[PDB]
Amino acid sequence: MNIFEMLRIDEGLRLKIYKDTEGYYTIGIGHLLTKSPSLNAAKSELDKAIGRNCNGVITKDEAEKLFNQDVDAAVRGILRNAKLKPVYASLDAVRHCALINMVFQMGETGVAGFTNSLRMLQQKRWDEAAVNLAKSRWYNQTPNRAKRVITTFRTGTWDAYKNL
Numbered sequence: 001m002n003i004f005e006m007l008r009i010d011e012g013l014r015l016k017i018y019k020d021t022e023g024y025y026t027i028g029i030g031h032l033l034t035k036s037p038s039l040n041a042a043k044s045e046l047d048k049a050i051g052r053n054c055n056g057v058i059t060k061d062e063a064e065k066l067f068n069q070d071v072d073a074a075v076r077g078i079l080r081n082a083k084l085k086p087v088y089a090s091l092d093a094v095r096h097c098a099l100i101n102m103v104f105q106m107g108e109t110g111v112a113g114f115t116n117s118l119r120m121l122q123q124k125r126w127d128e129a130a131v132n133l134a135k136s137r138w139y140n141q142t143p144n145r146a147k148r149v150i151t152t153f154r155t156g157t158w159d160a161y162k163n164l
């Protein structure tokens with residue numbers, strides 16, 4: 001299992017513009033287009049992202065290209081972020097994925113806000129971190145996904161994703 005398979009399970013794949021769990025226009029594999037309520041603004045953002053007149057729909061290959069760009073951006077963002085870098089650097093390869101997953105979903109700014117959880121992860125206090133991570137809007141709004149990511153942080157294994 002790897003970061004791509006992980007996020008593919010968490011985000012799914014849709015080739016037409018759709019609304020994510022927060023009601024925002026999105027496409028492909030969790031690629032947020034805009035927080036704006038206008039489907040037209042969304043269509044504009046899509047065409048600009050893809051480089052062609054899509055009219056609201058893309059191909060699987062286009063979807064995978066956006067996905068690759070997004071994962072790369074997330075990793076690079078983490079690596080330049082003063083608060084995230086140290087944490088990421090202290091973790092093993094499996095747990096790196098759980099952190100990238102959160103950043104992919106909430107943005108680095110949002111993740112950088114889990115200060116207490118972040119210190120616990122740095123200290124490798126797994127069970128404590130898991131409890132703290134659960135005390136969040138994130139857990140309450142998307143509990144099944146949050147549980148998968150949290151279990152990953154807690155165990156350092158892919159068990160939460162095996163069988164999906």
Ligand SMILES: [Cl-]
Pocket residue numbers: 134135136137
């Ligand atoms: Cl809470």
Ligand SMILES: [Cl-]
Pocket residue numbers: 141142143144145146
């Ligand atoms: Cl969920």
